[PDB]
Design a protein around this ligand. Structure first.
Ligand code: A1D49
Ligand code: ZN
Length: 323
């Protein structure tokens, strides 16, 4: 008779009021993040290397520094890769982890393995230090409000290893992080003791971010069972714009677009979604014109965009959590 799983089909947004946003637009400050959240991620960081680890620590410190009561839990494993077994580790960052329901956020901190062509390295700027670093200034910004969390539903933050693939994408050499977890998180009952429900059973919603940081992104509305949460993201945008809180932004050149399209882009939402969770996959289509090049660097980013895309995702969740 598990009622409380049923609670994400229908759950509505706590829509904020005119000058509620007008703070959130000033609670969030991009540069800090860009100096402090971001640039310590812009190093090679494929798995088994030191740039992993280093990426792993800098993420956690910036989830420990916070007043909110995060519990950071690690998921280390070994998993045959085309270079033989190796050691992976998802980050997790749940508020209130016996809370039955979690809005989830997500994004692979690893980064593809690219030969130092022309002596140059691949750091993953759009792909995806921006999502991770987007997923820190949330926390920080919403520190002040998340502290009130100490409708059984909070937040949680994940960070994936080996989304990418060492050599050639495939179902045995891609999304190593997700695949392993989404496994587990279907086997780890939840809350602790629940005899017919698994943590997934509480995963309200998998907002995935990925390939973020370049101008003029284009986010399709991939799914029918998460439109109403896609739409939510357009709306917020619509008016934020018409109030004056965005930066180099035009109605025509909006980000989300309620134009469903061709088809699927498989990413780390998948193993969960191939198990029956709502995703809110936030992946532009077209990708950036740099996607997997030694030009995915920091320059080829756009401040004004992520700043704008920063504001939207913090608002969305607030409304969501009802805070
Ligand atoms: C303009 C760039 C378009 O190129 C594409 C790149 C990736 C994909 C998707 C679609 N199916 C996949 O498996 N893709 C893929 C490949 C590698 C990735 N690394 C991170 N995300 C990836 C997605 C499609 C077009
Ligand atoms: Zn990639």
């Amino acid at each position: 008779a598990s009622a409380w799983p049923e609670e994400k089909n229908y759950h509505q947004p706590a829509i904020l009021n005119s000058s509620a946003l007008r703070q959130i637009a000033e609670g969030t400050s991009i540069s800090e993040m860009w100096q402090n959240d971001l640039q310590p991620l812009l190093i090679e960081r494929y798995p088994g290397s030191p740039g992993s680890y280093a990426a792993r620590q800098h993420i956690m410190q910036r989830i420990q520094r916070l007043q909110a009561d995060w519990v950071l839990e690690i998921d280390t494993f070994l998993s045959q890769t085309p270079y033989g077994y190796r050691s992976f580790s998802n980050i997790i960052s749940t508020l209130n982890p016996t809370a039955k329901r979690h809005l989830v956020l997500a994004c692979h901190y690893d980064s593809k393995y690219f030969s130092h062509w022309n002596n140059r390295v691949f750091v993953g700027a759009t792909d995806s230090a921006v999502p991770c670093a987007m997923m820190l200034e949330l926390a920080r910004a919403l520190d002040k409000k998340l502290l009130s969390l100490k409708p059984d539903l909070s937040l949680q933050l994940i960070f994936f290893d080996g989304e990418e693939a060492f050599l050639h994408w495939s179902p045995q050499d891609s999304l190593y992080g997700s695949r392993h977890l989404a496994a587990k998180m279907a086997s780890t009952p939840h809350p602790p003791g629940a005899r017919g429900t698994s943590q997934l059973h509480g995963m309200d919603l998998l907002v995935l971010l990925d390939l973020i940081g370049a101008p003029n992104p284009t986010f399709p509305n991939f799914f029918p069972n998460s439109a109403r949460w896609f739409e939510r993201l357009q709306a917020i945008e619509h008016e934020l714009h018409e109030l004056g809180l965005l930066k180099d932004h035009s109605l025509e050149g909006r980000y989300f677009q309620n134009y469903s399209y061709g088809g699927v882009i498989q990413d780390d939402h998948i193993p969960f979604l191939r198990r029956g969770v709502p995703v809110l996959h936030l992946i532009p289509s077209p990708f950036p014109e740099v996607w997997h090049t030694m030009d995915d660097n920091e320059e080829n980013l756009d401040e004004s965009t992520i700043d704008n895309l920063n504001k939207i995702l913090q608002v969305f969740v607030l409304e969501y959590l009802h805070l």
